[PDB]
């Protein structure tokens, strides 16, 4: 079929098919005003705080935000109108209802209205797509350090000496698989790494500064 | 045999067997004055700068420093005198010369003189031994970062946007085997890691401060 | 050929072939007086301290002691005379000399004289054979213990608490391959193990006591 | 959600949400009086023997003791108040009831009261956490020994001789997986190991003695 | 080339090329009188005891016996004359000498004389070939049995009871690879196996008896 | 719980709990008269042929015979009284009925009466336990032999010759897993193996004879 | 139990248990008249065409034919009467009905009547058993051939040349697993293989002819 | 370098460099008259039988025939003149002689003369190249068949029955690696395969017949 | 040592150590005039065509070009003077000569002169370094296509139909390992791929056009 439709989005598809023309047009306007990099939580909170929006939009907001992952899975080589028609067929086949012709056309028209524009969201999910062409990425880390004292073969001598060691442990996702990695350190190397990363941070700040003509974004 | 004698230390063993009584006693005194954690390079440089020492000591200094790795490979359960005798036999069997009885006894006596004392050096190599009961340890790392701009399907629109990414690569030894590991980062996580490691550094400083009654050393 | 002859035993075979009749007969007598479980070092030391024995016996003593490993590799189903003849052929083919007929017969006769009797030595090496039908056995072990103190998140509180841990490491041979194994313990389990092994030791002593009619040996 | 809530603790969560203010405050006091290293069985028995405590506390005692494993899974970087709120939400979502606002606030307040303090319990579970950063640990062992007699090829000779062997078998957990290991011994090595472990025990006693200023605990 | 010529048979090939016409004809006669199943040792001993045969035949007897393994490696589809010519070329190329034309023709003629006939030897090596189309075959075995007594937890009771066990170990060749296999038995199963193998032996004797019109051979 | 109670033994446990005092005492007497090595079938048949025994004993006879496998799974270090109490609790928790206090005490008392004594049965199952510390054991075997005739490339010659081969196939259990093994033989090796096993059988008979002071049993 | 009873044969077992004495005796006679190698389809068709036989026999004919696979799974070492009794017990335990004593005895008697004789069928399934002691066997094959023409780099030259190739593909069962194998051929090798297989066919015909005293069968 | 020059072709390259102009031109003519599919042996025999050709051509004939494998390893995209120059350089660098300029030019001119034309040979080696784009191909096979008789459990019955089986074994090269494959057959399947391959042979003959306008070749 | 010195560059190092001051200064000037992306062949050809340069420069030109791979293996964190000193030591230790002090200083000074500047070459090898942080890259490919005709089961019908197929094969290096990959295509997909790659080529041209302020290079 046209799309690998999740079975949970079917209610959102029904809401969008039955949604009012005013609501879809206003949502399209707001999406066209959406800045790049906005996340799902902020979008849904803004929808909630918008009084003119019924709960239908918020209940379908996740589906709307999910469009960015399929807005680029589709390509300019195809006609958005035919994409809307085929996806309406896919939803009527695998979704909640075999939509009647009038609501089928309403859903297709709403798809065309909303799937159009969608520029900043599509670019955001492209940045995310360009982001993870790689193999792996961090998620978190934890630092652990221990100290241990030095003893004698015969304890007729009191313990005067010890040793301090350091450990780091990190977490990351590789090829859609979560992972972690464990290492032990000494303070001097930690300081050296701090110097390296501080130098790279200054580089990054200078890069912020270099192209005042262009914007550079953090995407989460 | 008593020891897995390196074939390069044979000249050092010959020098020690023929070494003067004054030189061995003075070297034993200096070693008994050696602070814990002193490395081979510093010891050899100090030997060189000491005028009373002939080149024999410096040429055997590496062997002297190598004793710490076998000073603990031996154990208090054995008699140092018999250890010296057996190692003299091992050297006379696998080493340069089948030592004559007089020089055999001279070598054994010199071993007893110098292998005795050797407290701080033995404790240093114990710290190194207690150090690497683990599996792996760092050696170095390198930070790499890249930036990339965002484009349009049709370049009727000028490029206004881009994305900045960061990469770290690290090197380490595991189970006597050198290794490396590669990861990509974002600035926020780098800052968070900096905060973590700075907190741990403050912890380490407070640990420096906590036990004024005991010393804690960095060993290299 | 008859035996997988070591190339170092060839000198011992030559000595035995040329050895005096008095010496071989006396050695056969002494071997027939040998108690079970005697090791090579004790046998060679006794040979050295025996004045009537020339250095030929001591230089061939290791070969004599090596017979126990091949005294059972052979079996009663074969004639010791033909075994001696075939092994003389094997030595003359792979060994030092193509023995002349007179010394060939002398060697065969000496083999028959000495390979005969050899009761306690053969039984000792059978015990060793019955010993290692298994897979693995110990060789040594080492006990290691460490202690570590408990700290606070904020060191406004002084450290009042710590923890003590124990470690054991062991060495063993499996299937002719040396091995080791590492574990960490607590004092209570160490005490419990001490109780178990003490109970088993009392069992072993009672077993010493139970069969006064039979002897039980430790073989090394 | 906030926590990987076990589905059996839901009743304990309900009890805690509906629990009396006097009971939660008294339990918080008792927990603040709890010494480090106390185990679940002793805590529950003490709760049972305490007359002022209803069966609600004992039925939720296991959940209370389970907090130590999640008291450190959380970290000081987060606000305990928000932790309580989020975990109340998690319980109301995955647990028994969609708690009403009044009992929701009661549960959050009770969490704040009891999750606070909890110093010795948290330190105990930290010691357990610091305990098992390793790979494996014992659980038990069993000692087995056998004896076997020596025979002749022809039994015209009566059996006068035998051999005694010893076996040890041990059990341990590695990486959350139970394991065992099997070895055979001789009495001499058993005695040698006894000597080693006794020496280490004397070391441990001297370590007990060395730091009178600090306490060291056994945790089970 | 025609054959994977062993480099040790080259002397035998030279002897055969230079061998007398009378000797080759007599050897061909004797081989045509050879019964099936005769082994190399018996053939060589008979050659030695035959006075009319020079040492040339015995020194080439092993090569003659080796022909059976290549007498069937060749096939009736090829002309024995051309086989002799090609193998003479192979020997002159890889062997001792680039044979002169006269001795080349002599060798080819001798090959034709002797490689002809060779009926019983060829059939014997065919039986050996038909023998080892399988995967594996025995070579030897050894039987081992042990007995062990039953003890009490407290030896206030004297040992009245024991247990007897049996072991068998076997050796075999599989796919040109030597192998062994180990098992433990009880007396009853040994008796049952004895009964089975005795029944099969009676079957084999009846099979000896059944076809008086045909002969059946043991080949070694 | 105390025991991994089979769910089929629950009826036997109920019968034993409700069983008469006379019956349990008589069964304990009979078990104390039981010789070592008696199997379940013989015990149950004897119970059936005993007129004073009701069907309760036979229906619980299998459970009684199953005690030997758990009579040694328990150990002398534990109190049989507490073992009976804990197993009564285990049965009342996982078994047919939450036994009333009077029948609970009756069951515990019956367990103490019958679980006591049980000397020969416990020793029998110990022999079985000492039996299978190994890896594998036989269960059966089958002997197969075939004969095949020798033919010619051209059948102008009548077939005069053939070959006889032998095969053995065996079955065994390894590590609680059934197994089999297949081999082909020749008559001579079969005869040799017969000689070996007959020699070992004579050894076993001489071992029967050697210790008239002790008994040795076959256990099935 | 006695047999791994298929759950579909239970109806056949019921029919046989209730079958008339005349029918079972007549079927036993017919089976004793059955020639070796008869397949299930022919046997069932003959049963159908036999007017004296009710549909009971045909409905149980498959079970009757299935006996050959278990007629040899049993062995002469066991009593056919006890085999019938035990299999009647197995059917009454795992089959349709807990047979009443009268019909149980009827079934056992019918088994004894019919399981007896059964000579040619048993020998047929033995031939099938002797057949598949091997690893694999054919099931089918398919021949495929293709031809391709030769072209020029520049087609200013007309194509005058081509190449013809051949392919064979085959199917077989190995170790109860179906398999296939694919190869490409040339006409000359196909002709050579035809010659080989024709020669072997002539060999097989001569083998048909050689032993007029014995019969040789094709079994399917 | 230009070509992976074999070190044995160096003499052929020298001969070609020093070869006469008449000889190279005549050889080029003959090669231009060579039909497609001619093999090395036939070409060399024709060269030998040609009186006008010196032994130089035959000694370089193998190199000439080897050109087809490198005549297509080169491609029309390159200039044959520059190919000749570069290969002359390669031969002068890795070959016998650092050719003088005059003989260097002679060799290049001879290469251009002979490497030109070479149409049928190049097409032949292209057919061979187009041949082995696949993975594997036959080399030979062998057919083996056996027969075995059927016996009784008790030989009171004479053997009346037997079974005949068939075996095929084949050899092939895969990915430049020689291989073989073993299977057992029955006469019926052999006949069926004969029918299949005969049908395919008739297909191949009809394919011979179909395109009278084109030729199709067998290449060896 | 400082560098993993190739043993072939030793002559280049000697030449550079003995090289004239004028030559090294002129070469440094020329290198500072070198544009980015220049390859070794062009650099060496330019050196050859430069009359003022002796053959010393060309013979050391490859070493000079090899500096880019080690100019970045070193880093700005180190002093180029000390790098030159350490590499002079490395060459004097592992290279041709233990350089005399005067020529040692000359070599160090020449290294400082030439290793300095080197901007475009270093950036070129950085681009190559930034190039192959990936895993693999192409080297070549080859396109192959075939056509095949459609036939009938019975050739009473003439062949009117066929099928055309296409194949592509490609070569690439992965992780310093050469590789290839094989696929079959149809004309339509080839056309579609042509359209895709043409669109991407237009994109690349527009990218050429977009940043007139910056240069973008092809590096080989």
Numbering used by the authors:
A (entry chain D), B (entry chain C), C (entry chain E), D (entry chain F), E (entry chain G), F (entry chain H), ...: 1 to 220
What does the paper say about this structure?
The ten eukaryotic COMMD proteins are core components of the Commander complex, with central roles in endosomal membrane trafficking and signalling. We find that while CCDC22, CCDC93, DENND10, VPS26C and VPS35L are restricted to the eukaryotic lineage, ancestral COMMD proteins are present in both Bacteria and Archaea. These prokaryotic COMMD-like proteins have very low sequence identity (<20%) to any eukaryotic COMMD family members but share a conserved and highly similar fold including both HN and COMM domains. Our biophysical studies, crystal and cryo-EM structures confirm COMMD-like proteins readily form homooligomeric rings composed of eight or ten subunits assembled from core dimeric building blocks and inter-dimer interactions that are analogous to the heterodecameric core structure of the eukaryotic Commander complex.
As an example, MBK5214510 shows evidence for the presence of dimeric, tetrameric, hexameric, octameric and decameric species. In parallel to the crystallographic studies, we also determined the structure of MBK5214510 by cryo-EM and single particle analysis (**[Fig fig4]; [Fig figs6]; [Table tbls2]**). Within the 2D classes there were clear examples of top views of both octameric and decameric ring structures. Filtering of these two different classes allowed us to resolve the octameric and decameric structures at ∼4.2 Å and ∼4.8 Å resolution respectively (**[Fig fig4]; [Fig figs6]**). The octameric particles resembled the octameric ring we observed in the crystal structure, while the decameric particles were assembled in the same way as the octameric rings, but were composed of five identical homodimers rather than four. The decamer determined by cryo-EM is more divergent from the predicted decamer, with a significantly larger central pore, and is also wider than the cryo-EM structure of the human COMMD1-10 heterodecameric complex (**[Fig figs7]-[Fig figs8]**). (**B)** and **(C)** Cryo-EM structures of MBK5214510 octamers and decamers. These different oligomeric species are present in the same purified sample, indicating a degree of structural plasticity in the stoichiometry of the ring-shaped assemblies. In both cases a star shaped structure is observed with C-terminal COMM domains forming a central platform and the HN domains lying peripherally on each side. AlphaFold2 predictions were able to produce confident models of closed ring structures using either 8 or 10 monomers (predictions using more or fewer subunits produce either fragments of rings (e.g A0A558G9V7) or physically unreasonable structures) (**[Fig figs1]-[Fig figs3]**). The modelling, biophysical data (**[Fig fig3]; Fig. S4**) and cryo-EM data (**[Fig fig4]**) thus supports the idea that the bacterial COMMD-like proteins have a capacity to form closed ring structures with some plasticity as to the number of dimeric building blocks that are incorporated.
